[PDB]
């Protein structure tokens, strides 16, 4: 059955991005909402809408493509996994693509990026790399 | 000029441009402003050789009769798409046309 | 709970007045143990599509039963086997 809803979200984005879809819908959760907003804030996706329903909510994402239909998102990668959880300290926060990408980190001050985690001197669970 | 090919063969990339399928007459008009014999392999990519036959045509009767007649279009696009405008029906690929006219 | 559609064939050379001796009896057997007969029928002489026991015709008989135990139709099938008057039979669950 479903074991990693976050990796399912990152893969839904990867598959939709591969075929250059305009948008995609997925069932919602709090961390998936916060992951999506960071992608919006960092400029990887266009917009996030939340659609309420009886079951668990729906997240609508809008993908971004530049001139000549070049993909803004190049890749997504799940780092921490149910089979093997990955944690890091602020002093060992990984840089993604030499700083040209981002790492999503779940810290005790919420879900933030790696550049901000070093700024706040907090570590936590490395959710995913986006570049 | 806006009735395309049958549904059982329509390419999926013409959905925006599209019983049988009817072309987007409204979209073709805005696109039209933005825009007989066999095609020899290497007409454009082998001009270093075709021009010799073009020159030899300008300069025997059996050759000229076929040469005059000579000098579906997938050969031509490759000779141009590899070098880095045309009517594009539903069955035709739109992703390889710089100025696609979605008219039948 | 169940309805059956018993059919059987009686040999064609039988004496006429002896035929009611078994049809009443075989229907009687088809009614013991809570087996209310819904309907009895009697088709006429029919030309069998092929020879059965070197016979060419037979008396087709249809009996419809309403039981919930099927031991009534088991008794019919047991009796029809050893009776030389009946030459072919079949029980069918209608529903």
């Amino acid at each position: 059955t479903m074991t990693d809803p976050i990796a399912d979200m990152l893969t839904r984005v990867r598959n939709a991005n591969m075929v250059r879809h305009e948008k995609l819908e997925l069932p919602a959760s709090n961390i998936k909402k916060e992951i999506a907003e960071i992608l919006k804030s960092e400029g990887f996706i266009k917009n996030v809408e939340y659609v309420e329903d009886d079951k668990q909510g729906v997240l609508r994402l809008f993908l971004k493509y530049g001139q000549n239909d070049e993909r803004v998102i190049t890749g997504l990668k799940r780092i921490s996994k149910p089979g093997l959880r990955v944690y890091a300290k602020a002093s060992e926060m990984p840089k993604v693509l030499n700083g040209l990408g981002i790492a999503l980190v779940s810290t005790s001050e919420g879900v933030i990026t790696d550049k901000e985690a070093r700024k706040r001197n907090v570590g936590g669970e490395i959710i995913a790399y986006v570049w | 000029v806006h009735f395309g090919h049958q549904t059982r063969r329509w390419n999926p990339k013409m959905k925006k441009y599209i019983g049988i399928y009817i072309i987007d007459l409204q979209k073709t008009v805005k696109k039209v402003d933005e825009a007989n014999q066999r095609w020899l392999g290497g007409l454009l990519t082998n001009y270093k050789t075709i021009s010799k036959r073009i020159k030899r045509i300008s300069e025997l009767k059996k050759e000229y009769d076929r040469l005059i007649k000579f000098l579906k279009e997938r050969n031509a696009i490759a000779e141009a798409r590899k070098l880095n405008v045309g009517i594009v029906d539903t069955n035709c690929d739109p992703d390889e046309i710089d100025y696609v006219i979605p008219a039948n | 709970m169940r309805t059956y559609e018993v059919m059987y064939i009686v040999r064609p050379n039988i004496e006429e007045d002896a035929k009611k001796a078994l049809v009443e009896r075989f229907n009687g057997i088809l009614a013991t143990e809570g087996a209310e007969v819904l309907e009895a029928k009697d088709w006429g002489k029919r030309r069998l599509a092929y020879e059965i026991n070197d016979f060419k015709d037979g008396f087709y008989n249809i009996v419809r039963v309403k039981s919930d135990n099927n031991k009534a139709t088991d008794e019919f099938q047991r009796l029809a086997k050893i009776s030389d008057d009946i030459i072919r039979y079949m029980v069918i669950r209608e529903d």
């Binding site: - | - | 059919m7 064939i9 069998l48 599509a49 092929y50 059965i52 037979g58 249809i62 072919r88 079949m90 069918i92």
Partner: protein, 54 residues
Amino acid sequence: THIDYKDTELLKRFISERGKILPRRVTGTSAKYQRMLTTAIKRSRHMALLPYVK
């Protein structure tokens, strides 16, 4: 409708001149109808209503 093995006149239409069951690609019957047809014909053959081989 449910095909009855007693209805020999309906059944004869689906057998051939040697008493063989006709393929459905020939008679145009559907798949579920042909299955009901086959059971009724085999039942009717047993009760001598239809021949096995004529």
